[PDB]
């Protein structure tokens, strides 16, 4: 119920749609369900995420960006304060990266 609307809001959000009678909506809705119910995935290891965060942090250090590294370690240790933490993190990590950019903090 909340699950079904979330899939609608996810497809409206990413594809930039609002209307639900566009055939491209219906293909993308059905693709989402068929992805979700066809399982070939793994399950997240919290330890694998903790190594990944540590690994990215050295990558930022090694490319001589201390201010991006010092943010990134800080943001991740503050974020890991209260499972679902690890899941959204693994989500955001895998979704995309090509990051080597400076990306200075705004007011955070």
């Amino acid at each position: 119920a909340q699950q079904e609307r979330d899939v609608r809001e996810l497809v409206r959000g990413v594809a930039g749609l609002q209307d639900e009678a566009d055939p491209n909506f219906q293909l993308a809705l059905n693709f989402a369900w068929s992805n979700f119910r066809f399982h070939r995935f793994l399950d997240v290891n919290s330890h694998k995420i903790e190594k990944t965060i540590e690994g990215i942090y050295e990558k930022f250090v090694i490319h001589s960006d201390l201010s991006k590294a010092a943010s990134w370690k800080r943001l991740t240790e503050e974020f890991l304060n209260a499972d679902a933490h690890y899941s959204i993190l693994s989500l955001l990590l895998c979704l995309s990266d090509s990051p080597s950019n400076s990306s200075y903090v705004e007011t955070p």
Partner: protein, 65 residues
């Protein structure tokens, strides 16, 4: 009351650390996409399942260009 909006305070705070993490990794996501993906991750879904979806619809809206 007070503790029920202070609960809305402590979630928007973690929503703000997560949005800062979102841009420094250079992801195309934003707060609107992220507010759905928090609710999905609460219900229990693979992060490998959500991301394969997003990697399609973000790639299928470039063909609608």
């Amino acid at each position: 009351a007070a503790a029920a909006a202070a609960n809305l305070n402590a979630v928007r705070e973690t929503m703000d650390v997560l949005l800062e993490i979102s841009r420094i990794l250079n992801t195309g996501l934003d707060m609107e996409t992220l507010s759905i993906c928090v609710r999905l991750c609460e219900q229990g879904i693979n992060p490998e399942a959500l991301s394969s979806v997003i990697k399609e619809l973000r790639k299928a809206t470039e063909a609608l260009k």
